[PDB]
Every structure is written in structure tokens, then in C-alpha cells.
Amino acid sequence: KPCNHVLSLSFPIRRDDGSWEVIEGYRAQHSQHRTPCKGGIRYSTDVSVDEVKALASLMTYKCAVVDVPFGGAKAGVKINPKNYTDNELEKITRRFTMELAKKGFIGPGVDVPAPDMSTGEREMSWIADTYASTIGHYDINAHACVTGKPISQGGIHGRISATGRGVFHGIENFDLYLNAGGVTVSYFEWLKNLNHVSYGRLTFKYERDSNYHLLMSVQESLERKFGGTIPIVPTAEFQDRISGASEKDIVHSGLAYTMERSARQIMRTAMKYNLGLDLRTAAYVNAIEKV
Template identity: 40%
Template sequence: MANTATVTETSGHTEYSFFQGVERNFDKAAKFTRFEKGILEQIKACNSILQIKFPVRIGDGVEVIEAYRVQHSHHKLPCKGGIRFSMDVNQDEVMALAALMTYKCAIVNVPFGGGKGGIKIDPKKYTPFELEKITRRYTSELAKKNFIGPGIDVPAPDYGTGAREMSWIVDTYASLNPGELNAQACVTGKPIAQGGVRGRTEATGLGVYYGIRELCNVPEDMKNLGLTTGLSGKKVVVQGLGNVGYHAAKYFQESGALLVGLAEYEGAITNPDGLDLEKVVAHRKETGSIMNFPGAENIPVSAHALELECDILIPAALEAVIHGGNAANIKAKIIGEAANGPLTPDADVILNKKGVIVVPDMYLNAGGVTVSYFEWLKNLSHVRYGRLEKRFSENMYGEIVHAMESMTGKRVTEMERKILLHGPDEVDLVYSGLEDTMITSYHEIREALKSHSGVEDMRTAAFICSINKVGVAYEELGIFP
């Protein structure tokens, strides 16, 4: 990953922190809201910052591990945000990501405050047993400082972590809080057997797909870009084939879009006639690289794939990959920020002047936290989604089909019967809730963009929506005498 502590803007020749970049976007939007300076400063500030160092025995020695947890906003509780394992973890990055979580939750109407955590390690250098020791010790440190709990702060997976690490966290928390009925709700992204929810793995990538699909279904917006409505036939470039990038690419391809470029850290490949995602993934698994894929052209420098001819560009890997130095070379008409902070503020200025629609990360990659919210609710209710209504729905559908057959004298085929009688499983309900969330939130942002004179980009409109919701919450709390 890129070092996000400081990023140099080529066009402006200035250095700024990732967190200051988030604040810059906040300030740009804040002037379009009604809140006084003091409330805006409270919304913007990180409420609680925990920096910890703890020893863990690794091999024959002891390592001192550096870690963080930031609670950006307490306007809603619990706080919510992932935990990443990376050598690039630092306080500035964690603060910025926690702030983005506050605004992200507000946009998609998820009642959480923003949080984020990180451990400064390279997970590839440790055995699973060593990673387990580090994760469990980190969890115990969070518990000591009251930085974890179902109603306090609920972590989730992020870069370098997954369901395995979440299972260690929930087990450690439960052992430290014996008898706590809602212990499973202390973390999301867990394995299904430990209270996880079906659909969480693909949630962020699916949310990216839903968000871009909704944009492409708006005739007015597509006309302004000189594009037809719908995703079918549109040329897409995806940078990053991790969990988010892979699933976003998968759903784009299934919808009829052409994957004309795929990029990973080892390089990129392109084919204007389209790439078969699953074959590329199989090739990478076999050879260790996406390079030299049959029928594709190699691009040795991965970042150059961002400048390919395409309709839609999906940066789904690193922060600050599009900046003042390369923004002018971007040819995409739509950029969907699947990663956190892939565009710097200077890049925003250049791309907005070019008429590019940038769909901001704080909305577009909110699928993960949306489904995490569903998992948290499931853990608090102690019942699987669909358990109460699935059979009832199937029986009702059966009665309707039977009535139709009796009235018409015709019978539906077995395949049609199977489709018509299908009651909602947990994953069906999760997908439905996510789709509705992404569609509703997109139109909230679009309405803010249209209704505020002087607002020219979706990021500013998204910040306006978030600030308004968080500001109202603070007002209702009555903490400003």
C-alpha cells in the first residue's frame, strides 16, 4: 500500500496528510450547510484516539507491536469501522479512515459513529498462530480501554484481515465478558458459524456495482456524458483484484459490461474486446501473476492502467493513486471510488473541470458497513434473517400459483414453479436491503447536487448530506448549552 501519512500533490507542490485531505473536502461542503462553526468543528474532530504498544512473543524473541483505534464521532453509538494489518498503518491514516466512516454511515443511514483501527505489521511475515496472538492481545488492549463492545465500538475486517481475525476477536471479547448475552455483536464480518451474516464477503463489491448501475440508469446523467443508459457494453477498468475489486468486476461482467483492463501490484493487462475475469483469476492462481494472460496486452506499470480508454474506472486498491500528476491523463468518464481515498483533492479539481463524474468512496464502498449493520442487528436479535418468514412466504406463493392454475387451466413448468415459490433466504434479504440502501442514498446525493447552487461534484454533495445528518444528531443530543 502507498504511504498515506503524507502525499505529495505534483500539481500543487504541497504536502498534506490523508486526514487533512478529508478535512479539506469537509470544509468545501460545510459552507453549504446551516450549522455554526462550533458544531462543524465538533463534527470534524476525532473524539477519541488510542495509540498502544504491546509486547508479543514471536519465535524466540519479543516484538513490540504498534496499534491504533480511533473513534471519530460519538453522535451515534456504537462506533463502527474496520481493523487493518499493514506496515503503512499510522495515526493519520486511521484518523482519516475513521472520519470517512462517520460520513459513510450517515450517507447510507446506518446509525453508527465512525471508527477505525490498525496494527502496524506485515501479516505475510507471521504464522497464523503468531497472528492469532497479536490479534487477541490487541483485542484485550481495546477491552481494557473500553474501545470495543456491542454498544461501544464494533470493529470489522479491512485490508489484511478477514473472518478468521474477527473470529479471534469475538472469542477473546466473549472470554473477557463471560455471560454477556450480546457478545457476538462486538464485531462484524465473522464466520457464519459464529454469528456472521450471509452476503458479507461480497457486500462492498456488490455495493459498488449497485451504485454505478444506478448512476448509469439515470438518462440525464448519461446524456451529459455522451453515454447510453445501462451497463451493457460499457468498457470498465478495475484496479485491484482483492475482495472488493474482484466482486465489483464480477458483477459488472455479469451485467454485460466489458472488462477492458485489470490491474494488480505486479502490473496490468488490457484487451479492448474484454477480459474473462474468472480465467484471469485462474491464470493468476496458476502462475502467480495476471501478466502474460493469453490474448491480453501487458502493461508493466500497474498505475498506467488507470489511463486506459474506458467508460468506467474502478480504483479498488490503494489510496491516492489518482493525483495532480496523472489526473489530466484519465480518459474514463465515470470514476467509482471502490477503495478509500483513491483520489486526492487536487485530482478532484482537475477531473471535475473535465466533466468526469466521480462517485465518492464515502458512498460507493458503503456496502460493507451496510451489511455489517445487518449482521449487528442479527446478533442483537439472535435470529437468522428469513427464519420467520421463508416458509410462510413459500406457502402463500404456492396458494397464489395454485389459484392461477385453477383459473386458467394451465400449469407452470417445474422451473417456473421453483422460481415463483422461492421464499427469501438470508442472503436474498441482505442483497435486497443493500440494493435499496445504495439506490436510495444515490438519489439523496444527486438531489443535494442539484439543489445547491455552486456544488459541482458528487463528493461535495455527499459531504453535505453527511454533515446535515450528523449535525442534526448532535443538536438533538443537546450537548451544546
């Protein structure tokens, strides 16, 4: 129930105007029953310890709902990003990463941050660069320390539309459940960074050849029965699927599978505990009993 770790930070930054500023940030790690802990970073002037603790607990239960092996975490830096230049924001992000890494609050097997509405992929790129340069230099998984990265930096295809299509799939099956698509795709990005290869790179051509061979088998089997028949032509949509086979297809399929499994589990929990239309309680009971 309670957050087991909470770190309060105070670090100096050297402003462009020529003044020193003290920046205070927070990082709450809720549960270490599953490692690493997954969590976003919020660049807002209204952040507090209570908010990061609550969001870390929510993150833990959200990960438990969609069977993502992550603990809950939440960071927050008490700044207004619209009052700082890009250089100052880069300095703030890199020093925050340094302080978190020194205290064991960042790392591919410890604590993986993610972007937020106030942050973005540039901040994730800065975090990954800072970690790989200084602390995670001798780590082969150094770039798996953060998710939400750009494609050139190790990001995953299909991350921008992850939350919306997760919401769509959750609605189609029928907060803790509907808003979990981004968490699943961040888990997939973490896996892809650990794999050091994109999804389907070794599989696409092989599966294409196997499908064509199956269609040729149907061809020849129907030609043997009666003496012209062409059961080798794929449908139009199958042809676009074959031609445009990429990582986003695998990511979308994994997201849909995860959402379907979680919806079935929530339905079964709601039936077992004699709940009606109160799906929030069913999801929370499922997450609590999984943890």
C-alpha cells in the same frame, strides 16, 4: 470535524523464536453521536495516527450517507503480517482485543471492528472469541462485538460479494457512496447477531404458502367466470426464487434498497444546492447535514 477519541497502545507478545516484542497499535473513534462506532483494523507497517483519524472521519461520513446508525472508527497495528506465523498473529490479535476491551474501545454497543485487506475472518473469529471469553462473558450480545466473522461464528451470508454488488447498484442508480455496500452488510450482520436468528427463518415458508394461496385464488376466480385454466404456475425464475430462498436474498434486497435510497437523496441534495456533476460535494453535504 475532529476525532474525539484516539488510543495509542503498546503491548508485549511472546514470539515463537523466543524473544519479546513490543507491538504498538492505534484506534481512533471519530464520533459518538451515533453508537456503536464502526471501523476496520489494518495490519500494516505503515499505519499512523493521521491515517486512522482520517479513515475514522471518512467512516463516519460514509455511515451517514447510507443511513447506517454507526459512528466512524479505525484501528491499525504496526506489524507486517508476512513476518509472523499464525500462532504469533493469533497472540497479537487476542492481546490487541484484550487491551481495546479494557479501555472501552471494543464492544457490541461501544465499538465494532471489521476486517480489512490485511486482515480477514480468522482475525475476526479470534477477536470475537477473546471478547466473549473474558470481558463480554456476561453479555448476551458478546458475539456482536465484531463483524466479518465466518458463517459458523455468526457471520452473514452475502458478505464476500457485498462491496462489488454495492458498487454495481450504485452505478446502476446513476467513494463515499459507491464503497458503502460492505458497511451496509456489516450493519446487517450486527443486526443479525443481535437478533440471534438468521433472516427469513420464520418467514420463508409462510410467504411461500401465501404466494401459492394467491395463485390458487386467481385460479378459482378465473374458473368461476368461465368453465382448465391454470394461473397457479409460477415462472421459472420465481420457482428458483422460491426453492432457493435464503438469507443472502434478504441481504441483497436490503443492500439494493439502501443504495437506491442514498442515490435518490444525493440527487436531491445536488439539485437543491445547485451542484452539477460534482456528486462528491453533494454526498459530503448530505452526510454533514445528516450528522
